[PDB]
Write an enzyme that holds these catalytic residues in place. Structure first.
Site, PDB file in Angstrom:
ATOM      1  N   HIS A  40     -57.327  47.166  34.770  1.00  0.00           N
ATOM      2  CA  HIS A  40     -56.412  48.141  34.197  1.00  0.00           C
ATOM      3  C   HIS A  40     -56.993  49.553  34.207  1.00  0.00           C
ATOM      4  CE1 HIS A  40     -58.194  47.790  29.832  1.00  0.00           C
ATOM      5  NE2 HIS A  40     -57.824  49.049  29.891  1.00  0.00           N
ATOM      6  N   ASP A  84     -58.519  40.675  34.212  1.00  0.00           N
ATOM      7  CA  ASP A  84     -58.697  42.117  34.148  1.00  0.00           C
ATOM      8  C   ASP A  84     -60.103  42.536  34.590  1.00  0.00           C
ATOM      9  OD1 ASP A  84     -58.287  44.811  33.500  1.00  0.00           O
ATOM     10  OD2 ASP A  84     -58.357  44.526  31.403  1.00  0.00           O
ATOM     11  N   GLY A 175     -60.707  53.914  25.691  1.00  0.00           N
ATOM     12  CA  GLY A 175     -61.740  54.725  26.296  1.00  0.00           C
ATOM     13  C   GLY A 175     -63.025  53.951  26.483  1.00  0.00           C
ATOM     14  N   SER A 177     -62.679  50.804  27.512  1.00  0.00           N
ATOM     15  CA  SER A 177     -62.191  49.916  28.572  1.00  0.00           C
ATOM     16  C   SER A 177     -63.024  49.900  29.832  1.00  0.00           C
ATOM     17  CB  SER A 177     -60.783  50.308  28.961  1.00  0.00           C
ATOM     18  OG  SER A 177     -59.922  49.732  27.992  1.00  0.00           O
ATOM     19  N   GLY A 178     -63.279  48.710  30.350  1.00  0.00           N
ATOM     20  CA  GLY A 178     -64.057  48.569  31.573  1.00  0.00           C
ATOM     21  C   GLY A 178     -65.540  48.505  31.307  1.00  0.00           C
TER      22      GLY A 178
HETATM   23  N1  LIG Z   1     -59.639  46.568  19.965  1.00  0.00           N
HETATM   24  C1  LIG Z   1     -60.237  46.835  21.118  1.00  0.00           C
HETATM   25  N2  LIG Z   1     -61.461  46.360  21.337  1.00  0.00           N
HETATM   26  C2  LIG Z   1     -59.532  47.420  22.177  1.00  0.00           C
HETATM   27  C3  LIG Z   1     -58.166  47.709  22.087  1.00  0.00           C
HETATM   28  C4  LIG Z   1     -57.478  48.313  23.144  1.00  0.00           C
HETATM   29  C5  LIG Z   1     -58.146  48.647  24.332  1.00  0.00           C
HETATM   30  N3  LIG Z   1     -57.512  49.222  25.385  1.00  0.00           N
HETATM   31  C6  LIG Z   1     -56.396  48.750  25.969  1.00  0.00           C
HETATM   32  O1  LIG Z   1     -55.779  47.754  25.562  1.00  0.00           O
HETATM   33  N4  LIG Z   1     -55.998  49.449  27.038  1.00  0.00           N
HETATM   34  C7  LIG Z   1     -55.072  49.100  27.946  1.00  0.00           C
HETATM   35  C8  LIG Z   1     -54.790  47.761  28.243  1.00  0.00           C
HETATM   36  C9  LIG Z   1     -53.839  47.434  29.211  1.00  0.00           C
HETATM   37  C10 LIG Z   1     -53.160  48.441  29.886  1.00  0.00           C
HETATM   38 CL1  LIG Z   1     -52.001  47.996  31.072  1.00  0.00          CL
HETATM   39  C11 LIG Z   1     -53.428  49.778  29.596  1.00  0.00           C
HETATM   40  C12 LIG Z   1     -54.376  50.105  28.623  1.00  0.00           C
HETATM   41  C13 LIG Z   1     -59.509  48.364  24.428  1.00  0.00           C
HETATM   42  C14 LIG Z   1     -60.182  47.759  23.364  1.00  0.00           C
END
Ligand SMILES: N=C(N)c1ccc(NC(=O)Nc2ccc(Cl)cc2)cc1
Ligand SMILES: [Ca+2]
Length: 223
Positions: A40, A84, A175, A177-178
């Site tokens: 994502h 993912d 932020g 993410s990844g």
């Molecule tokens: N609670 C967390 N650890 C957490 C929550 C949300 C995210 N981020 C996302 O869910 N982002 C995301 C997921 C899918 C898509 Cl399609 C776009 C953004 C990361 C960590």
């Protein structure tokens, strides 16, 4: 990262920032020319920034290398977020040293109860927004797959695990993410999703990297 601590410059040498004019996702360096991140986070025009601590200031240990190829997992489903994960090849190999180093891929899946290190430059608040400039770290246990599935009924596949604290307060966030989840010196997870951040009974959900090791090795062998 919500409720974590400042890592200290270059104490997490495999942590990468993916930049397209601004930081938008983390990643992990797994050898001198390949980065693993979340599917994502895919964008065209990725520049990988290695050796970072403050992402807004040039401090001297950075290597900025652009991506030559991105490969999203063939079964990535953006609706369920199953699978993912994505591989990014660098245009030239990074120079590896004590401050820029790769992280090993796992030979076994980690079990519930193992304490892991999650890191990233994402949001530090569960209400409101404040993005740090320096890398934040969080130590967190992998949770049992039955508590993970009770927190998120009907949403956890075999390629996901939960890590965190069911009482909330500490978690990764947008932020982040990844980015990496490292347990016993091996990459076990990729920051993937969750409901809000650090909320009670809504732990973070992570891509289970031990299920993808043959796909990663095979793809790096042919690309
Ligand atoms: N609670 C967390 N650890 C957490 C929550 C949300 C995210 N981020 C996302 O869910 N982002 C995301 C997921 C899918 C898509 Cl399609 C776009 C953004 C990361 C960590
Ligand atoms: Ca910097």
């Amino acid at each position: 990262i919500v409720g974590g601590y400042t890592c200290g410059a270059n104490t997490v040498p495999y942590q990468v920032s993916l930049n397209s004019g601004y930081h938008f996702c983390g990643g992990s360096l797994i050898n001198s020319q390949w980065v693993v991140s979340a599917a994502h986070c895919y964008k065209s025009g990725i520049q990988v920034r290695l050796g970072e601590d403050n992402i807004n200031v040039v401090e001297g240990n950075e290597q900025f290398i652009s991506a030559s190829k991105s490969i999203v997992h063939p079964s990535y489903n953006s609706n369920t977020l199953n699978n993912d994960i994505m591989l990014i090849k660098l245009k030239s190999a990074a120079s590896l040293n004590s401050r820029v180093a790769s992280i090993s891929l796992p030979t076994s899946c980690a079990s519930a109860g193992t304490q892991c290190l999650i890191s990233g430059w994402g949001n530090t608040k569960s209400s409101g927004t404040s993005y740090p400039d320096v890398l934040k770290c969080l130590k967190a246990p992998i949770l049992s797959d039955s508590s993970c599935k009770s927190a998120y009924p009907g949403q956890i596949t075999s390629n996901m695990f939960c890590a965190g604290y069911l009482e909330g307060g500490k978690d990764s966030c947008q932020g982040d993410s990844g980015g990496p989840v490292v347990c016993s010196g091996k990459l076990q997870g990729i920051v993937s999703w969750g409901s809000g951040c650090a909320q009670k009974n809504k732990p973070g959900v992570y891509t289970k990297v031990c299920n993808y090791v043959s796909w990663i090795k095979q793809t790096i062998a042919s690309n």
